[PDB]
mmCIF file of C-alpha atoms and ligand atoms in Angstrom:
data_model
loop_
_atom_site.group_PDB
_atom_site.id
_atom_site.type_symbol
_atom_site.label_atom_id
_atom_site.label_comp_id
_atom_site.label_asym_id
_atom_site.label_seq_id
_atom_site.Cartn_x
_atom_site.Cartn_y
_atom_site.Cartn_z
ATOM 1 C CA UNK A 28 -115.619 110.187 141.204
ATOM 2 C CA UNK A 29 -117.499 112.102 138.307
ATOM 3 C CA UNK A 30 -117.497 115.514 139.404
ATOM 4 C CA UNK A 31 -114.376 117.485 140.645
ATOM 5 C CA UNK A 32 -114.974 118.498 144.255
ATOM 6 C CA UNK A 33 -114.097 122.652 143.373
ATOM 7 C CA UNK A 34 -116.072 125.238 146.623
ATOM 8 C CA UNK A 35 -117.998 124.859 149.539
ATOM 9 C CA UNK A 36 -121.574 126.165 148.943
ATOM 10 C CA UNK A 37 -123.696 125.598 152.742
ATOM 11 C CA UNK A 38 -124.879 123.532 155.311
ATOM 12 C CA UNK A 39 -128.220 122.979 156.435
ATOM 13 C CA UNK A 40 -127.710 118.844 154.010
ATOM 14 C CA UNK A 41 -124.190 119.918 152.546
ATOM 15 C CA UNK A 42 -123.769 121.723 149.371
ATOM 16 C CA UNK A 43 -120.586 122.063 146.863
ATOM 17 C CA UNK A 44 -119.589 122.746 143.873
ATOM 18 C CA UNK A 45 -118.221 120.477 141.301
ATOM 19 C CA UNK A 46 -116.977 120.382 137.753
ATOM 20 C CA UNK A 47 -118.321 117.580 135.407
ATOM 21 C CA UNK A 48 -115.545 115.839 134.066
ATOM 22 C CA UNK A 49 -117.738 114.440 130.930
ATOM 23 C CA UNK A 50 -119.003 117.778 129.746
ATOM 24 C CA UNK A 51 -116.374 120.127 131.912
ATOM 25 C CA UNK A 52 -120.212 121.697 133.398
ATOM 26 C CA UNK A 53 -120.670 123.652 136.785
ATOM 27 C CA UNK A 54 -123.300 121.889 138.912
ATOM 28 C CA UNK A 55 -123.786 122.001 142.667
ATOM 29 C CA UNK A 56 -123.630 118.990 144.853
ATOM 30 C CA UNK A 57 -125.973 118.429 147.306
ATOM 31 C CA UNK A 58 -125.274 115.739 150.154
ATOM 32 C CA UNK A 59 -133.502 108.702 153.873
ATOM 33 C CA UNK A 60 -137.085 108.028 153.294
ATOM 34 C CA UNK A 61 -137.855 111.566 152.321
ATOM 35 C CA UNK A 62 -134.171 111.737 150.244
ATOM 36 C CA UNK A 63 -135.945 109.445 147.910
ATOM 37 C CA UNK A 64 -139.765 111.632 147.958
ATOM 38 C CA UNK A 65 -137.415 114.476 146.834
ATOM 39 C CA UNK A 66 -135.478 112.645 144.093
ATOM 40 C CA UNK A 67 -138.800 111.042 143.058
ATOM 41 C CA UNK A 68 -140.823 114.487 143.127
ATOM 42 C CA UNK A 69 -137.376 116.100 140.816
ATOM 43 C CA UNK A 70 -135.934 113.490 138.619
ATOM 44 C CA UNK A 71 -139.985 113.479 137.030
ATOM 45 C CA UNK A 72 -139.847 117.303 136.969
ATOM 46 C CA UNK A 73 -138.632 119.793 133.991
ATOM 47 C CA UNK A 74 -139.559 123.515 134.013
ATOM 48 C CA UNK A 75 -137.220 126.321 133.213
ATOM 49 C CA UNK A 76 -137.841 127.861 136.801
ATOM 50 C CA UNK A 77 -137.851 124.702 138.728
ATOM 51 C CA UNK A 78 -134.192 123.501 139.584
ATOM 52 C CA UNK A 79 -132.978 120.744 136.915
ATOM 53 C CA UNK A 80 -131.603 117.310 138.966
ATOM 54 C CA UNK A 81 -129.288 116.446 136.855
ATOM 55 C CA UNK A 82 -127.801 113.101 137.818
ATOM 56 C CA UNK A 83 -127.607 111.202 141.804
ATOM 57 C CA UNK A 84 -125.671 108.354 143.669
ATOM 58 C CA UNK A 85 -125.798 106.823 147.376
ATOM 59 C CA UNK A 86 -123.489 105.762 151.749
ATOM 60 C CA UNK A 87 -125.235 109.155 151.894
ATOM 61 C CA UNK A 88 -126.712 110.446 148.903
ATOM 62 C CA UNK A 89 -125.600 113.223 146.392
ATOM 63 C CA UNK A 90 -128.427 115.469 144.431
ATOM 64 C CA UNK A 91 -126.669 116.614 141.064
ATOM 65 C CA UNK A 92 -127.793 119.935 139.822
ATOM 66 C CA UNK A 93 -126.714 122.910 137.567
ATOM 67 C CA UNK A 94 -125.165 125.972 139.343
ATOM 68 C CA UNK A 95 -126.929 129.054 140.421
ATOM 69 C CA UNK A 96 -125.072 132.392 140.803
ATOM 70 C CA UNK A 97 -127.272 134.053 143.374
ATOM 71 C CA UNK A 98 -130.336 133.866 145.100
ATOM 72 C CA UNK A 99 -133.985 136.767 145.613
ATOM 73 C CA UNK A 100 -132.459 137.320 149.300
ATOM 74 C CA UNK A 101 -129.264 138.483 148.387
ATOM 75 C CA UNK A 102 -130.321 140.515 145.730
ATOM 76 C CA UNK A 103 -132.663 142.154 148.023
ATOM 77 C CA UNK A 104 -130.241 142.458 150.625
ATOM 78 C CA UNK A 105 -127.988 144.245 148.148
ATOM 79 C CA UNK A 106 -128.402 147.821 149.357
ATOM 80 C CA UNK A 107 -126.587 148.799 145.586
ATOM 81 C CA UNK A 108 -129.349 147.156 143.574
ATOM 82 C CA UNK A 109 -132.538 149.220 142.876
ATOM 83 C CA UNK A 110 -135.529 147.109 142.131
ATOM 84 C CA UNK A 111 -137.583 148.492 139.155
ATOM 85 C CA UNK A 112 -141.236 147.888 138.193
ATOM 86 C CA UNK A 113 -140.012 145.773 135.552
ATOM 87 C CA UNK A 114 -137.634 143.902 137.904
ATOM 88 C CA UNK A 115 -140.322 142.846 140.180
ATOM 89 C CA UNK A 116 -142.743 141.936 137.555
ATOM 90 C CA UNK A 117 -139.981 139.461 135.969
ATOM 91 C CA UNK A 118 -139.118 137.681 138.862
ATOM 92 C CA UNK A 119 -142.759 136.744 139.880
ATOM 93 C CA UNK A 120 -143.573 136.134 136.188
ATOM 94 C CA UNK A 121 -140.533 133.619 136.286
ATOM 95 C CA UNK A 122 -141.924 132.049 139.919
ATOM 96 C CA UNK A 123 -145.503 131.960 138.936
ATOM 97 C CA UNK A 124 -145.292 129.749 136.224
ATOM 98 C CA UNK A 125 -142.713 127.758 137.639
ATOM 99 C CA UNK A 126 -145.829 127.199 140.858
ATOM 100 C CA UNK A 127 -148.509 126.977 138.324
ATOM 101 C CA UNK A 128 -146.259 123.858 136.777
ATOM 102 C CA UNK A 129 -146.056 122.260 140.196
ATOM 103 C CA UNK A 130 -149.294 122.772 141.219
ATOM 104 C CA UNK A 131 -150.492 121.367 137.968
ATOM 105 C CA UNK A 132 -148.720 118.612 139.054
ATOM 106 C CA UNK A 133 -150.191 117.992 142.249
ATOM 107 C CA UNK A 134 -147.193 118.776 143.873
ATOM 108 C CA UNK A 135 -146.623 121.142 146.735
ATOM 109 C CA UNK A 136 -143.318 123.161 147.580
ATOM 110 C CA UNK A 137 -144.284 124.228 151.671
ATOM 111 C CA UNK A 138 -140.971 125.935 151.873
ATOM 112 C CA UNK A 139 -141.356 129.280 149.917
ATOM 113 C CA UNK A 140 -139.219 131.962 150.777
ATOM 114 C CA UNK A 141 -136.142 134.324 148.845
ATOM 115 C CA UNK A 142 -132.849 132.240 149.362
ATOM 116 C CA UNK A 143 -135.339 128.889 147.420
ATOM 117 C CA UNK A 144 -135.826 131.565 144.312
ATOM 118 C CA UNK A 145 -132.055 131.272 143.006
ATOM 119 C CA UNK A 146 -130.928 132.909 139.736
ATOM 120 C CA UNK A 147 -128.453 131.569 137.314
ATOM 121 C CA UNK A 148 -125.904 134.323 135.119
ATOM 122 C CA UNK A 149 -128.727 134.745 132.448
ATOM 123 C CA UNK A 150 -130.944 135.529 135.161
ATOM 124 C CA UNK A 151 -133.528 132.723 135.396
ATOM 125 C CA UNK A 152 -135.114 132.447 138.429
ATOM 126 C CA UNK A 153 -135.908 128.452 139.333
ATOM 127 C CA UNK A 154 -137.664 127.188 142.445
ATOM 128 C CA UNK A 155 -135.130 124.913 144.726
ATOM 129 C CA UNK A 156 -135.205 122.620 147.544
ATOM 130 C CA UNK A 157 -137.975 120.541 147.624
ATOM 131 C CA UNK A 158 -137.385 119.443 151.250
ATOM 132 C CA UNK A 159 -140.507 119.438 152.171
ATOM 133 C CA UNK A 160 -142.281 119.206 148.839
ATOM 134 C CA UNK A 161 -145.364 116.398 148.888
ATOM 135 C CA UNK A 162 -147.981 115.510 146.666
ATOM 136 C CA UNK A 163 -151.288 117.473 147.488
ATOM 137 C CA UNK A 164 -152.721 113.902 148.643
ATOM 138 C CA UNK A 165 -150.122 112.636 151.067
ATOM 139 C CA UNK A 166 -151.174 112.935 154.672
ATOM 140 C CA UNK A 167 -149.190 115.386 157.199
ATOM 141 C CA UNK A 168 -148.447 113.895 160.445
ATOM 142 C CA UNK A 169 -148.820 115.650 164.157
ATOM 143 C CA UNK A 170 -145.201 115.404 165.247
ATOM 144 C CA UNK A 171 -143.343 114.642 161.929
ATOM 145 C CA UNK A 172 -145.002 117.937 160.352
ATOM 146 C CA UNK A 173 -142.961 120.326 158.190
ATOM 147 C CA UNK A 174 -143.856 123.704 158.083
ATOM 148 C CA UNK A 175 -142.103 126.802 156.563
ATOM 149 C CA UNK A 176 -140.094 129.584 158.338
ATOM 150 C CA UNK A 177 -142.340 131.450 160.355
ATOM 151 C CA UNK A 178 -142.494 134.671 158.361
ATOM 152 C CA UNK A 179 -143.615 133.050 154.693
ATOM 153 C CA UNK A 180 -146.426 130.682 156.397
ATOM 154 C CA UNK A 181 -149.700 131.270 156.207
ATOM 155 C CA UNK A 182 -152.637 131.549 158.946
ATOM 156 C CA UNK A 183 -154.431 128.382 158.188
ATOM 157 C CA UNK A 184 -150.798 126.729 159.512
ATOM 158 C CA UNK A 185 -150.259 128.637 162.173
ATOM 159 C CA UNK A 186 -153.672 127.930 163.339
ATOM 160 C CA UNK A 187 -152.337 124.042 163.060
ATOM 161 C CA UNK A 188 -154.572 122.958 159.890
ATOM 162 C CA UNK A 189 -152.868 119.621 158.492
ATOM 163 C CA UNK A 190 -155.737 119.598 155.884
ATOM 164 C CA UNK A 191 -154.053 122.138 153.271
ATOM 165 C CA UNK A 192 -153.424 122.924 149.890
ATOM 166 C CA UNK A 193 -152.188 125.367 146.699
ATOM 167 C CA UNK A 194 -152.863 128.981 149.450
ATOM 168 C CA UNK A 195 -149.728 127.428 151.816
ATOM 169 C CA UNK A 196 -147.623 128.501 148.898
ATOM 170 C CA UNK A 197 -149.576 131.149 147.487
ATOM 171 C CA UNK A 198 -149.828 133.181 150.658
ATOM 172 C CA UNK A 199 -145.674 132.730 151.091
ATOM 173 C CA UNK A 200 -145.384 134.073 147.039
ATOM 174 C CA UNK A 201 -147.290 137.419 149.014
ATOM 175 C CA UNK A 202 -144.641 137.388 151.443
ATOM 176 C CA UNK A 203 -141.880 137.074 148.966
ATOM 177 C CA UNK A 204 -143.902 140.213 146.901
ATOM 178 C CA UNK A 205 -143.766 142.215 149.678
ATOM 179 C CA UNK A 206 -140.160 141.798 150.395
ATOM 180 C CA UNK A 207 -139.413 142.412 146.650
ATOM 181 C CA UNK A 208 -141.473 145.948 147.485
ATOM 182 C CA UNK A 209 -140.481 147.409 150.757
ATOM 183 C CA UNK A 210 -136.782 145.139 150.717
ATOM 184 C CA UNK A 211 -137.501 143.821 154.025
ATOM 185 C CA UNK A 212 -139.402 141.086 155.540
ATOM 186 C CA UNK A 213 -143.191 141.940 155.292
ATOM 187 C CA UNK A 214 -144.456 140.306 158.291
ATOM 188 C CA UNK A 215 -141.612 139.325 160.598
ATOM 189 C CA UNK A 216 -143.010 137.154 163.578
ATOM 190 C CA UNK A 217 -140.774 136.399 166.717
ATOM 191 C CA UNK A 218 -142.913 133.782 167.857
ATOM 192 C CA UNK A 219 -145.544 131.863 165.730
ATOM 193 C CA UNK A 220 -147.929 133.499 168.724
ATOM 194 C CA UNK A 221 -146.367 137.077 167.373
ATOM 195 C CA UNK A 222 -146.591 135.691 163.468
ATOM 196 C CA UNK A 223 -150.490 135.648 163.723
ATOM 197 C CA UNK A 224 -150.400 138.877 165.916
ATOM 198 C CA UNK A 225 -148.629 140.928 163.115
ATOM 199 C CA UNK A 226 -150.677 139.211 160.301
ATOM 200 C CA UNK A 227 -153.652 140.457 161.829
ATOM 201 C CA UNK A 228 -152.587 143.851 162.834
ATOM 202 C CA UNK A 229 -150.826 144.287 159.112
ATOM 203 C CA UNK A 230 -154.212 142.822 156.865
ATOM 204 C CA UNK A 231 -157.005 142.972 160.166
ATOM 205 C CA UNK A 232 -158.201 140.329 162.368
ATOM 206 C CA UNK A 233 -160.525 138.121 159.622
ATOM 207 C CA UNK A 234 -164.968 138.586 160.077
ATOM 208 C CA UNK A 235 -166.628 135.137 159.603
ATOM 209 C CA UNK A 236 -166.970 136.424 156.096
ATOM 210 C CA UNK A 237 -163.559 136.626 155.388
ATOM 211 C CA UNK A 238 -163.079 133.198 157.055
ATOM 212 C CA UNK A 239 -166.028 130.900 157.230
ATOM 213 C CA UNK A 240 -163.997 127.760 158.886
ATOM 214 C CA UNK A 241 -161.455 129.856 161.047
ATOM 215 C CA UNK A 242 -163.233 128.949 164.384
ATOM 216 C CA UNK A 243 -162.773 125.112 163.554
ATOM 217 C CA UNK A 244 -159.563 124.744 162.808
ATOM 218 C CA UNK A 245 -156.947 122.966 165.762
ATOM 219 C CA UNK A 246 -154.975 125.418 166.947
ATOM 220 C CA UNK A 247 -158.183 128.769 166.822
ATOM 221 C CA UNK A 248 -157.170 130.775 169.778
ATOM 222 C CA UNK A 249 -158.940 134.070 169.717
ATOM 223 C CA UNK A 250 -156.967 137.278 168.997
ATOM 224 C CA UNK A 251 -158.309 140.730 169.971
ATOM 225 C CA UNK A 252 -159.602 142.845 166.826
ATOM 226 C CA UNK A 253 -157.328 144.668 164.602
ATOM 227 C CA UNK A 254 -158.733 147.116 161.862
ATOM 228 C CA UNK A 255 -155.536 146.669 159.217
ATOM 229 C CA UNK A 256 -153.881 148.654 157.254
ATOM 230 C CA UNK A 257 -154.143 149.789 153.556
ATOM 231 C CA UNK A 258 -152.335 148.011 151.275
ATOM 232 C CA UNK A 259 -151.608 151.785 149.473
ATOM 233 C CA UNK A 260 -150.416 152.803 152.720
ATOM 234 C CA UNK A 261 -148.557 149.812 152.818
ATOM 235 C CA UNK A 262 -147.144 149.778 149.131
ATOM 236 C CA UNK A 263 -147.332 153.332 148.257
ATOM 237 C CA UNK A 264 -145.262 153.090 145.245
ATOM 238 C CA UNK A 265 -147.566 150.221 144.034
ATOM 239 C CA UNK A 266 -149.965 150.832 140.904
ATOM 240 C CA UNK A 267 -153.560 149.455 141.433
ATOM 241 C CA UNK A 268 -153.359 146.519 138.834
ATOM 242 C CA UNK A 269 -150.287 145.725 141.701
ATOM 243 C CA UNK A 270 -152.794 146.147 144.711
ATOM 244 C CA UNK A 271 -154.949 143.600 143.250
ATOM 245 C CA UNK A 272 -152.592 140.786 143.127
ATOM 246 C CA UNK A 273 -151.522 141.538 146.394
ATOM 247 C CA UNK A 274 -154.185 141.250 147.721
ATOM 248 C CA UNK A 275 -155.208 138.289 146.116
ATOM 249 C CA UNK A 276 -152.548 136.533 147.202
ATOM 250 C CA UNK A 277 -153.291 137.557 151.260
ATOM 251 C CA UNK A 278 -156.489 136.842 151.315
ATOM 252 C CA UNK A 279 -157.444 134.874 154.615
ATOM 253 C CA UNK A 280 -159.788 132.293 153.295
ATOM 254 C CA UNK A 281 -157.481 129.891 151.451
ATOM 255 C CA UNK A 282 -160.033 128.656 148.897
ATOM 256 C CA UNK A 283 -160.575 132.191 148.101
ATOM 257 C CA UNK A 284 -156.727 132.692 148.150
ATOM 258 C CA UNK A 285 -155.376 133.508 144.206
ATOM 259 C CA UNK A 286 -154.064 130.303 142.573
ATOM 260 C CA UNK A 287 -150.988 130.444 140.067
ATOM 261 C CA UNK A 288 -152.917 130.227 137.014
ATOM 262 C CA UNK A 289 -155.482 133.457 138.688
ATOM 263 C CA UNK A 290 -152.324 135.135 139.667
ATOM 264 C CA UNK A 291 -150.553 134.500 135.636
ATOM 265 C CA UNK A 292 -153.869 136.095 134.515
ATOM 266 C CA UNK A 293 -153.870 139.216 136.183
ATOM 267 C CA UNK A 294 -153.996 142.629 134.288
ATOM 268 C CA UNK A 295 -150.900 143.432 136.623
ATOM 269 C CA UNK A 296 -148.784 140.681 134.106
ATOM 270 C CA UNK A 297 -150.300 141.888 130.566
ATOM 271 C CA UNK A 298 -149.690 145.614 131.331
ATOM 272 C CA UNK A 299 -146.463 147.680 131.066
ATOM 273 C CA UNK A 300 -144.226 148.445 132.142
ATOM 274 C CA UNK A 301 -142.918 144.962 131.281
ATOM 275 C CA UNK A 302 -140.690 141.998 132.525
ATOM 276 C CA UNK A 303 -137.365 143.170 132.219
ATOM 277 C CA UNK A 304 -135.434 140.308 129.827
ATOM 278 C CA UNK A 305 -133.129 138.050 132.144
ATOM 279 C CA UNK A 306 -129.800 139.186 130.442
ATOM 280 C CA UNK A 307 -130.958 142.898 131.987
ATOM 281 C CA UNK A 308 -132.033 141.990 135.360
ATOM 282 C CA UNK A 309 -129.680 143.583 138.413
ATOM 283 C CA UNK A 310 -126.733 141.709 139.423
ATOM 284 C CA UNK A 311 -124.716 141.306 142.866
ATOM 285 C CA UNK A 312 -120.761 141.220 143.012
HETATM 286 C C1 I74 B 81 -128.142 122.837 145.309
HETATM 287 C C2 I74 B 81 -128.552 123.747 144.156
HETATM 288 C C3 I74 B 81 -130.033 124.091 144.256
HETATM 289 C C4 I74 B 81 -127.681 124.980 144.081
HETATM 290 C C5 I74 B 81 -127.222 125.550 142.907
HETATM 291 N N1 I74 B 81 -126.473 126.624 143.092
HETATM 292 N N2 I74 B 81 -126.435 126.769 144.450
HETATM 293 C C6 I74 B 81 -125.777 127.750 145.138
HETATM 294 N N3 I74 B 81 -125.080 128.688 144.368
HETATM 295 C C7 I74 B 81 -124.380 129.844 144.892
HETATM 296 C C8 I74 B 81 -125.296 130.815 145.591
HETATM 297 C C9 I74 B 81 -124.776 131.851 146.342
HETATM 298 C C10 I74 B 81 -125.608 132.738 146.981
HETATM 299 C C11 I74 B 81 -126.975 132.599 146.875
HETATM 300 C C12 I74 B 81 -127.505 131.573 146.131
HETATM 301 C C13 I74 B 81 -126.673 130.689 145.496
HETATM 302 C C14 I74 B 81 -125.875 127.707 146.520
HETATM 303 C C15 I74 B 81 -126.618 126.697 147.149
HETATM 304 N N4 I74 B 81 -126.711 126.657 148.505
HETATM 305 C C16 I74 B 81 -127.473 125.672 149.252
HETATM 306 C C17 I74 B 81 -128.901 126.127 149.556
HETATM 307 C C18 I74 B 81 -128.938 127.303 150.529
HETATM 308 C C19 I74 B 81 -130.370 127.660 150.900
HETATM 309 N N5 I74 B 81 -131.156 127.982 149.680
HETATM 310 C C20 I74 B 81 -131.146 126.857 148.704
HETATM 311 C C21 I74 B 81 -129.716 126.490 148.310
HETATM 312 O O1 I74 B 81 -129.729 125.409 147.381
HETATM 313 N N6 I74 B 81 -127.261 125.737 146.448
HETATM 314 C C22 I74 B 81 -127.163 125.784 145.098
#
């Protein structure tokens, strides 16, 4: 009754967008006990690169928030855009401190992945649906849990830990890295069996060293022994200040694993080339 019904947007939920009739604005329309976790965790919330609720109402309930053009998986889809240096360093720049924000915040996202980076026209990138977000404290169920798509999520899941924390999203910001690099999924499972199998075979099967706890966690099923591959070989376009957040951000022990503040700190971010400015980064038609 506020906002003027204008385009369909998706369905998972049920998206659209509307015009304002107060302030004439663009916003997108999105329309249970964890509708109200996700209002709670975002009406709290204001970051530049975390999506901006805006307004709600119930009698299902509408999520009020400012338009986004775009999205990291259709710009790396789009076979016409060239990612630069600068590009890639921008976009993770913009993500990372929108994750060091929520993690600051206790809060976790647990549903990293491209199409949840979207961009708005001046070409800030903001972290969206918090679906699954919780508060690091709040238990995870057996039955009710929620887990990301099977490429982004990280061992300690797939081995069925329900004790987790900050590496869950970490390790999916190294997925969404490599896809920025090679423009395709990094590690894409067909089977959460196959996810582990092509984790291990990509990075090597973990030592005890690497992974002090593996063995105890639920779901440890023993995989044969895989030597890797070289992240160089891997990423051979990749500088070494590059390497070294990379592989920071994969590594298997997840209170080892690179936090957002480690990540923000990394030569990789205070070197050049730099962040290309927003207004400049590569646009889809
Ligand atoms: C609800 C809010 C976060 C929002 C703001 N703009 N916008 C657009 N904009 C158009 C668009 C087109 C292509 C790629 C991304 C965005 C699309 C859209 N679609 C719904 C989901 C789809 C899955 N990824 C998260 C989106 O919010 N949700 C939104």
């Amino acid at each position: 009754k506020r906002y003027e019904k204008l385009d369909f947007l998706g369905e998972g939920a049920t998206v659209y967008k509307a015009r304002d009739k107060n302030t004439n604005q663009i916003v997108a329309i999105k329309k249970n006990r964890t509708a109200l976790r996700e209002i709670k965790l975002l009406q709290e919330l204001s970051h530049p690169n975390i999506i901006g609720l805006l307004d709600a109402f119930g009698s299902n309930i509408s999520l009020v928030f400012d338009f986004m053009e775009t999205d990291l998986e259709v710009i790396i889809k789009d076979n016409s855009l060239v990612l630069t240096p600068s590009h890639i360093k921008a976009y993770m720049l913009m993500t990372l401190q929108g994750l060091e924000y929520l993690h600051q915040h206790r809060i976790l996202h647990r549903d990293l992945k491209p199409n949840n980076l979207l961009l708005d026209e001046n070409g800030v990138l903001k972290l969206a649906d918090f679906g699954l977000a919780k508060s690091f404290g709040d238990p995870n169920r057996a039955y009710e849990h929620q887990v990301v798509t099977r490429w982004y999520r990280a061992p300690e899941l797939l081995f069925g830990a329900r004790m987790y924390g900050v590496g869950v999203d970490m390790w999916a910001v190294g997925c969404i890295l490599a896809e920025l690099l090679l423009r395709v999924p990094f590690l894409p499972g067909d089977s959460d069996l196959d996810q582990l199998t092509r984790i291990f075979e990509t990075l090597g099967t973990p030592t005890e060293e690497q992974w002090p706890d593996m063995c105890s966690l639920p779901d440890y099923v023993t995989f044969k022994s895989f030597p890797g591959i070289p992240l160089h070989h891997i990423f051979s376009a990749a500088g070494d200040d590059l390497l070294d957040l990379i592989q920071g951000l994969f590594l298997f022990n997840p209170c080892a694993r690179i936090t957002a503040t480690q990540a923000l700190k990394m030569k990789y971010f205070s070197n050049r080339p730099g962040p290309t400015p927003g207004c400049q980064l590569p646009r889809p038609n």
